[PDB]
């Protein structure tokens, strides 16, 4: 329980999830071409959200 | 949110109506804590510049404490006026619209039947 | 003559499509020069010639500078134009086709919205003073010297500051 | 720091205060070759400020009371121990080399500050442009390792191009057997315990890298010993030198002002010498670092800022 | 950098946001934003190395594109209503593109991809002036039109801002990137409270500014751009580690530090407006922000990292670097929690 | 599509299982297209074929998660004869998490997705029963 | 006028699409920015001419001045980029990621 | 937190200056003459020009 | 404005050309000068919230004065109904709508 499974369940799994999430969110290439294409996707999504909210 | 109220002059620290408020007593825990913050600022400054902690810069510590007390006093007067005018507008709207704030009749603990939840 | 402004606006949209499609910046500057010429024509159509003539002259000097910079440093051995690449020409003709389709949809489905075939040429000049002196567009720009002195000083300070900005950047 | 942008506006123009003898002249030679007396006589008879070779205790002599402190405060490196056993496992050789480079950098900053503040020229002995020679001598003799060489090159890259090169570099060409004879005649037994291979590596480092890279950017004055050991003809050459190259020509008042700010704030001077590259030759650790630091603050005259230590006679502490 | 250019550039940097805040004209707000950008470009390129060149180029194209989207919104509003202000009945599309452009000007996620890149490669004082001064005028414009903006778009922008700010600050080691992601999370909080109470947005902006200013000053003390570089501060300047710890804990927002006060009052007003889910998610991502803050504190203050030999010579030398405003801002950003009714309005 | 996700809730749970599965699959597919577009834009593939393959993989994975979640929620509601019970949504969220773990080929992600998506779906059901506002208009 | 304004809105929309979709040339990006500027100028001028707002006629000249200052600063940054890397290719400016 | 897609990263420089490969200077070569009024007909002056 | 230096010092750096019905050069009124004037005097002193509900009549007049959406739709139907009648031939244009009129000054 204590040295294996409660540690595997709550704290180490939370740390693993947040480490994987920060790796995926900051695995960036540093290319502003990709950054501006992402900005275009953001603009398109905001237009879509406004159009469906009306 | 109070910036659109009627009779709102733009950009003055203390309007004339604020002079109708009782001023701070000048020996109260807020201004005493402001002076203590100024003294701690002076001690922090001395320790960071590697001077003696209180044996150096007595004039600097005095200026820090006095400026902190001064700014705290005037800011405290401003917030006292702001809270006073907030309560004044609140009570004015409450008096102006009594049909939205009815004096509800609360019954006593002989007409109200609270449910009983036994612990056993 | 009624759809003259519509033809000009379609040509301006085509020039902006080529500019967005991005050929070599020689051809990009050429497309934006003809877009500035078309925009000058539209301003002259809608009213006072001062604004259109001024933006034409300003972009003539501006893209003089842009062409000089492009032939200096924004060049490669084999410049890329609209038709040298199959993909770029494909999106060019696709954009033209999609523009035609979009104006057809706004003509048919939406009826009198932003585009109307029968109402074209009827709502270009809304109201004009039939008898009157000092109605041209240059009078307001002159009144910037008199009515909007804040606008005059912020434009002048922008140019002065920008001179200092460029000197500091290209100081090297 | 009294000098600043306000002082520059009110007028402290370096080009206004310069003259014909406001030069940085560095004398360089082998380990024992006529270098100390030559620079001293040049400075004496041309009216420049003489700066001897920045040793281990240079920072200790230029800061505080100026007495040489204990070695654990002043670097924990010994030239005598390097001469006795250069390949020791404590890493004394590269520790001494890096400490001497830091001392030379502080001396260069001090000399540049003196030149840009007073206008009087400086005559340095073996400045920072001639310390990679000792680097490469240690490396080719196997005394240090490639990680030490790369770390020194990194610090040299971070600290070198922010300063100006010397106006004149004077070189003394003395052969290796003559260096042997002069070292034997000096009488220091640690200095006798050196190798002709090490001195030949020093001379090779001179002739292959130091002389041309300053030849392309300043005035080079390779002189023999007999042209030397007579510090008057070299002075006539310095007088009739023409400086028509190097980056000193393109400098103006504001570039001098920013360089003066950089060389007067010593923390930015020695900022990049304390990079956190964890090389075991230089790194110390928490316990030893804290013990040495606490002993240094308990040292007399070093507990507070200079001017605030009541034990050394500072007065009006409560009013400043 | 001669004093004439210094005075002109610094006066234009000051004048930009002042014009933007003082102008009742949306166009004059736009031209104030133009002054701010065009004036801060040379201060970014001032080091003249490739990293600052990339940073200045990325900053220029990002703020230029955002400025043109602002100008589109202003011109469309002028076409629709005939005035130069989003008064009450401007189009929601115009308001949303205004929000998009001002958010990408501010640097909040998912428009935040440039901000760590821009603040990296520039000097620390330029990062300070960027992250403090450039974020007042866009927030002023957003404050001017608070009842008209879209609560759902603002709230989703706030959530993604705090999420990617917390994750980025968790990942990076560099000080400037860490403060960039901290800034992204703090703008997430300010936008989260913006549609409901702009006074709380101003309070959070002031608290964040007085929190991030002396942290940047402490970074300027030794030009420490690395976790290790700020870790050997115990040998460099030991009399500052307590203030570093207290300011980083206040940045994390624990009681009784006064940096808990903005998050506390923000979630109080948010729950007054019944968005408890939104407040809870924001608070847990603030806990992640505090996690990377606590890792920084562990690195620099509570443990003593190994030091090198030349730090002895650095301790031999003396410095007059920390100015008069460092201790004042540090104390007012550390121990001002009992003055909470005075700090709020 | 606002009418589409409103017509998700026009019928109580345990009724129109095919309809609820189809709308939930469509919503998961939309979210997968968004995520795939973000992934392709930020981290570009080596080729357009690899990019469209990644878009297809992401869209199919998210559509599978949504389909399994909606299907298992509706089946659990039908079997247990009570629609307004968040345990059905917890079972559906666990099924979606196991679908995610099966697509990613890792039991750790399977269990993680089970717990997190079950909690999220249970909170969603509680909020839709008791009128929680996710993006409330400012009222005070 | 509404068809003209819709065409101008579409011209700005495609110019913004080109601005947001980089190609190999930073000068091509700057030219897309200038197309956005021209689109906005033409909108403001035709709106002022339609509404007869001579009080708002200084607005197009002001956007011309400020956007030309933007163009000047962009050309200065582009000459810095070309001096550093030989060309203005936007894929060269990617070393700030780490 | 190094991974497969970010293990190729290097730490940033301490002074924010990156060493790049020295690009070859493309000074243009002009064949001034021989068919030129200023070359006096028979001079092939090849010119290495910067600008 | 976020800050009110212009209101405090009494200056009008940019407050005098905020709308069409403001000051114009040489007393040449903009389009819908009276309709915007009716909207501004309605909405003053009641706040932004009460302006959207109680000044809807003046704003609706001002909006389609400036945009003419109802004018175009009304005018399009007349041209559409007339053009439909020309196919069936049960309508003819008058001489004064066909270019053959008696002009007047
Ligand atoms: C030596 C030090 C003292 C020198 C005093 C010299 C001057 C003097 O004699 O003044 C007399 C003066 C006479 O006061 P009074 O007009 O008779 O009214 C006093 C009543 O008790 C009326 O006072 P009250 O009890 O009604 O207090 C009013 C109110 C408003 O007062 C305040 O806000 C002041 C709070 C001060 C603490 O206080 C509070 O709301 C208390 C909030 C407590 C929780 C705050 C949570 C944050 C953490 C703790 C505070 C921050 C410490 C530093 C950070 C580290 C935290 C671990 O007494 C004081 O000013 C009392 C406070 C003095 C000590 C201040 C703290 C040290
Ligand atoms: C006037 C006569 C023009 C054509 C003269 C001629 O000899 O055409 C040969 C041409 C056949 O080409 P070729 O002589 O076999 O190939 C060598 C040419 O140099 C190959 O031609 P190039 O190297 O000059 O490149 C042609 C390129 C570039 O040339 C142009 O753009 C010319 C038109 C400028 C107006 O044009 C295109 O790729 C197609 C452009 C289509 C119109 C632009 C539509 C989008 C932009 C809208 C604004 C345009 C401003 O037909
Ligand atoms: C008393 C508490 C407040 C003290 C503030 C000043 C602190 C300071 O300067 O400490 C140094 C100084 C002692 O220095 P020193 O030993 O003389 O020589 C300096 C060393 O050579 C310097 O050696 P070094 O620089 O070479 O290396 C030392 C360095 C090496 O660095 C380290 O070792 C790093 C340590 C890292 C771990 C600690 C991180 C920070 C933790 C902060 C506290 C957190 C927990 C508390 C709860 C949350 C608080 C937000 O630093 C330290 O070891 C610690 C330095 C700071 C210690 C004092 C911290 C004070 C603030 C925190 C405690 C008080 C507030 C919270 C609690 C409130 C009550 C519940 O402390 C004092 O002098 C304390 C003040 C004593 C006189 C008070 C007189 C009051 C008079 C009142 C009447 C007159 C004014 C009337 C005004 C109103 C008129 C109307
Ligand atoms: C909400 C409003 C109403 C709905 C609106 C429409 C739908 C909106 C959906 C929003 C949530 C999803 C957002 C996804 C963003 C991109 C994630 C991604 O894949 O990044 C990878 C990409 C790098 O890809 P890579 O380098 O190839 O990595 C390889 C993988 O590690 C290789 O890993 P792998 O092989 O396992 O790949 C399989 C792939 C397959 O999965 C996907 O492709 C996406 C799956 C999404 C599942 C979660 C949503 C499920 C919803 C079910 C609803 C059921 C019905 C309702 C009842 C229950 C309600 C609870 O999974 C992933 O890639 C997972 C990525 C991490 C996702 C973390 C999501 C956390 C929040 C979840 C709840 C929301 O990272 C980035 O691009 C980083 C920057 C992302 C910035 C995003 C900023 C916006 C996010 C929110 C947008 C909200 C709407 C627009 C608002 C206005 C914005 C301006
Ligand atoms: C029976 C009851 C059941 C119900 C209750 C369950 C919850 C109980 C309470 C939760 C306890 C969580 C404990 C979290 C901390 C422990 C993990 C940890 O210490 O991770 C350390 C690790 C960093 O270690 P590092 O220093 O890099 O390397 C090791 C040696 N150098 O760290 C990492 O790698 C990353 C750490 C990330 C931060 C963790 C703490 C913040 C978590 C925020 C959660 C947000 C939840 C909402 C998320 C969005 C919606 C899904
Ligand atoms: C040195 C400080 C000198 C201060 C001089 C007076 C400044 C002044 O006029 O302040 C008034 C200012 C604006 O007052 P108000 O009309 O309410 O504006 C809306 C703001 N929410 O009031 C405010 O901005 C209120 C908050 C002031 C905070 C000051 C300390 C930070
Ligand atoms: C009921 C529990 C279902 C759990 C599904 C799951 O996520 O399983 C994880 C597992 C990982 O797959 P792996 O370990 O690579 O090997 C299986 C290859 N058939 O994946 C599988 O086992 C997937 C098997 C197919 C789907 C089964 C449901
Ligand atoms: C709103 C909705 C938000 C949903 C947010 C979550 C989305 C689904 C989960 C995504 C997880 C991504 C990271 C991951 O895969 O974590 C699984 C982790 C590591 O698994 P591993 O074998 O290392 O696989 C390679 C990494 N994928 O595997 C583990 O850590 C194993 C943990 C097993 C026990 C987990 C028990 C539940 C823990 C949380 C309890 C909360 C109360
Ligand atoms: N290992 C090492 N030793 C150095 C370095 N710089 C100087 N030394 C040593 C060499 C000598 O033993 C000692 C003194 O050097 P000098 O060249 O000044 O010799 P000295 O003053 O005895 O004679 P001289 O100046 O030649 O007339 O310092 C260095 O960077 N590394
Ligand atoms: Mg000597």
From Swiss-Prot, chain A:
Belongs to the complex I subunit 5 family. This is NADH-ubiquinone oxidoreductase chain 5. Signal peptide: none annotated. It is found in: Mitochondrion inner membrane. It comes from Mus musculus. The chain crosses the membrane at residues 34-54. The gene is Mtnd5. It comes from the Eukaryota. Core subunit of the mitochondrial membrane respiratory chain NADH dehydrogenase (Complex I) which catalyzes electron transfer from NADH through the respiratory chain, using ubiquinone as an electron acceptor. Essential for the catalytic activity and assembly of complex I. Core subunit of respiratory chain NADH dehydrogenase (Complex I) which is composed of 45 different subunits. The lineage of its organism: Eukaryota, Metazoa, Chordata, Craniata, Vertebrata.
From Swiss-Prot, chain D:
The modification N6-acetyllysine is found at residue 87. The modification N6-succinyllysine is found at residues 87, 250. Coiled coil: none annotated. Signal peptide: none annotated. Changing residue 215 to A: Leads to mitochondrial depolarization. Its cofactor is FAD. It is found in: Mitochondrion matrix. Complex I is composed of 45 different subunits. This a component of the hydrophobic protein fraction. This is NADH dehydrogenase [ubiquinone] 1 alpha subcomplex subunit 10, mitochondrial. It comes from Mus musculus (Mouse). The lineage of its organism: Eukaryota, Metazoa, Chordata, Craniata, Vertebrata.
UniProtKB/Swiss-Prot annotation, chain H:
Disruption phenotype: Knockout mice show early perinatal death and major defects in the CNS, compromising especially the postnatal development of dorsal cortex, corpus callosum, hippocampus and cerebellum. Neonatal neurogenesis and gliogenesis are deeply impaired. The modification N6-acetyllysine is found at residue 10. It is found in: Mitochondrion inner membrane. It comes from the Eukaryota. Disulfide bonds: none annotated. Core subunit of respiratory chain NADH dehydrogenase (Complex I) which is composed of 45 different subunits. Component of the iron-sulfur (IP) fragment of the enzyme. Interacts with NDUFAF3. Interacts with NDUFAF7. Interacts with CERS2. Core subunit of the mitochondrial membrane respiratory chain NADH dehydrogenase (Complex I) which catalyzes electron transfer from NADH through the respiratory chain, using ubiquinone as an electron acceptor. Essential for the catalytic activity and assembly of complex I. Redox-sensitive, critical component of the oxygen-sensing pathway in the pulmonary vasculature which plays a key role in acute pulmonary oxygen-sensing and hypoxic pulmonary vasoconstriction. Plays an important role in carotid body sensing of hypoxia. Belongs to the complex I 49 kDa subunit family. This is NADH dehydrogenase [ubiquinone] iron-sulfur protein 2, mitochondrial. It comes from Mus musculus. The gene is Ndufs2.
Curated annotation (Swiss-Prot), chain I:
GO terms for cellular component: mitochondrial inner membrane; mitochondrial intermembrane space; mitochondrion; respiratory chain complex I. Keywords: Disulfide bond, Electron transport, Membrane, Mitochondrion, Mitochondrion inner membrane, Respiratory chain, Transport. Disulfide bonds join 32-65, 42-55. The keyword Membrane applies. It comes from the Eukaryota. The keyword Secreted does not apply. Residues 29-73 form the CHCH domain. It is found in: Mitochondrion inner membrane; Mitochondrion intermembrane space. Signal peptide: none annotated. It is a peripheral membrane protein. Its main location: mitochondrion. Contains two C-X9-C motifs that are predicted to form a helix-coil-helix structure, permitting the formation of intramolecular disulfide bonds. Belongs to the complex I NDUFS5 subunit family. PANTHER family: NADH DEHYDROGENASE [UBIQUINONE] IRON-SULFUR PROTEIN 5. Mammalian complex I is composed of 45 different subunits. This is a component of the iron-sulfur (IP) fragment of the enzyme. This is NADH dehydrogenase [ubiquinone] iron-sulfur protein 5.
């Amino acid at each position: 329980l204590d040295l294996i499974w409660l540690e595997k369940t709550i704290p180490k799994s939370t740390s693993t999830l947040h480490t994987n999430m920060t790796t995926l969110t900051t695995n960036q290439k540093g290319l502003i071409k990709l950054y501006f294409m992402s900005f275009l996707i953001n603009i398109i999504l905001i237009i879509i959200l406004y159009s469906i909210n009306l | 949110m109070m910036n659109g109220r009627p009779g709102h002059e733009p950009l003055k620290f203390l309007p004339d109506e604020a002079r109708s408020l009782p001023p701070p007593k000048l020996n109260d825990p807020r201004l005493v804590y402001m002076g203590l913050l100024g003294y701690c600022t002076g001690l922090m400054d001395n320790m960071l510049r590697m001077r003696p902690v209180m044996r150096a810069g007595l004039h600097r510590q005095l200026l820090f404490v006095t400026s902190f007390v001064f700014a705290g006093y005037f800011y405290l007067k401003r917030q006292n006026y702001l809270y006073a005018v907030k309560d004044h507008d609140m009570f004015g709207y409450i008096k102006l619209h009594p049909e939205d704030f009815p004096e509800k009749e609360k019954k006593t603990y002989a007409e109200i039947l609270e449910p009983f939840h036994p612990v056993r | 003559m009624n759809n003259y402004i519509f033809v000009l606006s379609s040509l301006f949209l085509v020039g902006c499509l080529g500019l967005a499609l991005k050929p070599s910046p020689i051809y990009g500057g050429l497309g934006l020069i003809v877009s500035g010429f078309v925009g000058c024509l539209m301003v002259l159509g809608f009213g006072g010639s001062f604004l259109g003539l001024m933006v034409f002259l300003i972009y003539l000097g501006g893209m003089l500078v842009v062409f000089g910079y492009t032939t200096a440093m924004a060049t490669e051995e084999y410049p890329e134009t609209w038709g040298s690449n199959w993909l770029i020409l494909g999106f060019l003709v696709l954009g033209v086709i999609m523009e035609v389709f979009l104006i057809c949809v706004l003509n048919y489905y939406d009826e009198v919205g932003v585009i109307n075939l029968d109402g074209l040429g009827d709502w270009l000049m809304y109201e004009v003073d039939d008898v009157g002196v000092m109605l041209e567009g240059g009078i307001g720009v002159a009144a910037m010297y008199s009515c909007a002195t804040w606008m005059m000083v912020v434009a002048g300070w922008s140019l002065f500051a920008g001179i200092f900005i460029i000197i500091e950047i290209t100081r090297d | 720091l009294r000098y600043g942008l306000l002082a520059a506006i009110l007028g402290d123009k370096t080009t206004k205060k310069l003259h014909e003898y406001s030069r940085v002249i560095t004398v360089d030679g082998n380990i024992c070759s006529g270098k100390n007396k030559l620079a001293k006589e040049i400075a004496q008879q041309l009216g420049m400020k003489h700066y001897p070779e920045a040793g281990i205790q240079y920072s200790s002599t230029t800061t505080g009371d100026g007495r040489p402190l204990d070695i654990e405060f002043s670097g924990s490196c010994s030239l005598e121990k390097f001469y006795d056993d250069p390949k020791s496992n404590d890493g004394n050789s590269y520790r001494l080399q890096s400490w001497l480079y830091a001392s030379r950098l502080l001396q260069y900053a001090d000399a540049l500050e003196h030149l840009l503040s007073t206008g009087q020229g400086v005559v340095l002995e073996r400045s920072i442009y001639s310390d990679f020679v000792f680097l490469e001598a240690m490396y080719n003799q196997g005394y240090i390792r490639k990680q030490c060489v790369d770390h020194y090159n990194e610090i040299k890259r971070l600290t070198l191009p922010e300063y100006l090169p010397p106006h004149a570099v004077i070189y003394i060409d003395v052969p290796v057997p003559e260096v042997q004879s002069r070292i034997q005649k000096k009488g220091d037994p640690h200095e006798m315990k050196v190798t002709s291979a090490y001195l030949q590596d020093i001379e090779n480092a001179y002739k292959k890298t130091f002389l041309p890279k300053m030849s392309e950017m300043c005035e080079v004055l390779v002189y023999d010993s007999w042209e030397a050991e007579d510090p008057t003809k070299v002075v006539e050459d310095i007088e009739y030198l023409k400086y028509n190259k190097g980056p000193w020509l393109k400098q103006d008042d504001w570039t001098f002002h920013y360089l003066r700010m950089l060389v007067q704030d010593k923390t930015e001077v020695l900022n990049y010498t304390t990079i956190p590259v964890y090389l075991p030759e230089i790194t110390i650790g928490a316990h030893q670092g804290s013990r040495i630091y606490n002993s240094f603050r308990e040292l007399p005259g070093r507990k507070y800022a200079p001017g605030y230590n009541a034990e050394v006679g500072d007065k009006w502490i409560w009013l400043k | 950098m001669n004093p004439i250019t210094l005075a002109i550039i610094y006066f234009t940097i000051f004048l930009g946001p002042v014009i933007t805040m003082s102008s009742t004209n949306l166009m004059l707000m736009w031209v104030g934003l133009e002054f701010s950008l065009l004036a801060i470009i040379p201060m970014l390129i001032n080091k003249k190395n490739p990293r600052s060149t990339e940073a200045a180029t990325k900053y220029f194209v990002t703020q230029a594109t955002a400025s043109m989207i602002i100008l589109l919104a202003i011109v469309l509003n002028y076409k629709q209503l005939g005035t130069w202000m989003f008064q009450q009945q401007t189009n929601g599309l115009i308001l949303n593109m205004t929000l998009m452009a001002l958010s990408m000007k501010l640097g909040l996620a998912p428009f935040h991809f440039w901000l760590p890149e821009v603040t990296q490669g520039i000097p620390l004082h330029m990062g300070l002036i960027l992250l403090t001064w450039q974020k007042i005028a866009p927030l002023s414009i957003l404050i001017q039109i608070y009842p008209l903006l879209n609560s759902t778009i603002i709230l989703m922008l706030a959530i993604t801002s705090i999420f990617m700010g917390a994750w980025g600050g968790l990942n990076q080691t560099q000080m400037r990137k860490i403060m960039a992601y901290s800034s992204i999370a703090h703008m997430g909080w300010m936008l989260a409270i913006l549609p409901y109470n702009p006074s709380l947005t101003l309070l959070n902006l002031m608290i964040y500014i007085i929190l991030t200013a002396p942290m940047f000053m402490a970074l300027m003390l030794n030009n420490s751009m690395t976790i290790n570089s700020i870790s050997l501060l115990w040998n460099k300047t030991p009399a500052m580690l307590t203030m570093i710890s207290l300011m980083l804990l206040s940045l994390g927002g624990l009681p009784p530090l006064t940096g808990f006060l903005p998050k506390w009052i923000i979630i109080t007003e948010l729950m007054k407006n019944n968005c408890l889910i939104m407040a809870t998610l924001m608070a847990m991502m603030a806990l992640l922000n505090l996690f990377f803050y606590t890792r920084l504190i562990y690195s620099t203050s509570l443990t003593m990292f190994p030091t090198n030999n030349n730090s002895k010579m650095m301790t031999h030398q003396t410095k007059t670097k920390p100015n008069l405003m460092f201790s004042t801002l540090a104390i007012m950003s550390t121990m001002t929690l009992p003055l909470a009714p005075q700090l709020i309005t | 599509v606002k009418r589409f996700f409103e017509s998700y809730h026009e019928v109580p749970d345990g009724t129109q299982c095919h309809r609820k599965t189809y709308i939930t699959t469509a919503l998961g597919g939309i979210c997968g297209i968004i995520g795939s577009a973000y992934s392709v834009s930020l981290n570009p593939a080596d080729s357009t074929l690899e990019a469209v393959a990644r878009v297809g993989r992401y869209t199919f994975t998210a559509a599978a998660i949504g389909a399994m979640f909606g299907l298992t929620t509706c089946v659990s509601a039908q079997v247990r004869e009570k629609p307004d019970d968040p345990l059905n949504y917890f079972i559906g969220g666990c099924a979606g998490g196991l679908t995610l773990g099966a697509r990613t080929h890792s039991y750790g992600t399977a269990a993680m997705g089970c717990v997190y998506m079950g909690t999220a779906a249970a909170l969603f059901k509680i909020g839709k029963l008791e009128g929680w506002e996710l993006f409330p208009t400012p009222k005070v | 006028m509404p068809s003209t304004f819709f065409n101008l809105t579409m011209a700005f929309s495609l110019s913004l699409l080109g601005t947001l979709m980089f190609r190999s040339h930073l000068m091509s990006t700057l030219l897309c920015l200038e197309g956005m500027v021209l689109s906005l100028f033409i909108m403001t001028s035709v709106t002022s001419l339609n509404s007869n707002s001579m009080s708002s006629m200084p607005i197009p000249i002001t956007i011309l001045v400020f956007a030309a200052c933007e163009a000047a600063v962009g050309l200065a940054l582009l000459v810095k980029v070309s001096n550093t890397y030989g060309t203005d290719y936007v894929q060269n400016l990617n070393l700030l990621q780490c | 937190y190094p991974s497969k897609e970010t293990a190729h990263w290097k730490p940033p420089p301490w002074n924010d200056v990156d060493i790049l490969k020295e690009k070859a200077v493309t000074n243009m070569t002009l064949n001034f003459g021989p068919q030129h009024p200023a070359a006096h007909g028979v001079l092939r002056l090849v010119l290495e020009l910067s600008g | 404005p976020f800050l009110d230096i212009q209101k405090k010092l009494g200056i009008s750096l940019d407050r005098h050309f905020m709308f069409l019905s403001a000051e114009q050069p040489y007393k040449n009124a903009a389009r819908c000068h009276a309709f915007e004037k009716e909207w501004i005097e309605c909405a003053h002193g009641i706040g932004g919230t009460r302006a959207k509900k109680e000044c809807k009549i003046e704003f609706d007049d001002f909006e389609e004065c400036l945009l003419r959406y109802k004018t175009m739709r009304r005018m399009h139907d007349i041209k559409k109904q007339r053009e439909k009648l020309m196919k069936e031939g049960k309508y003819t244009p008058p001489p004064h709508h066909s270019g053959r009129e008696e002009p007047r000054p």
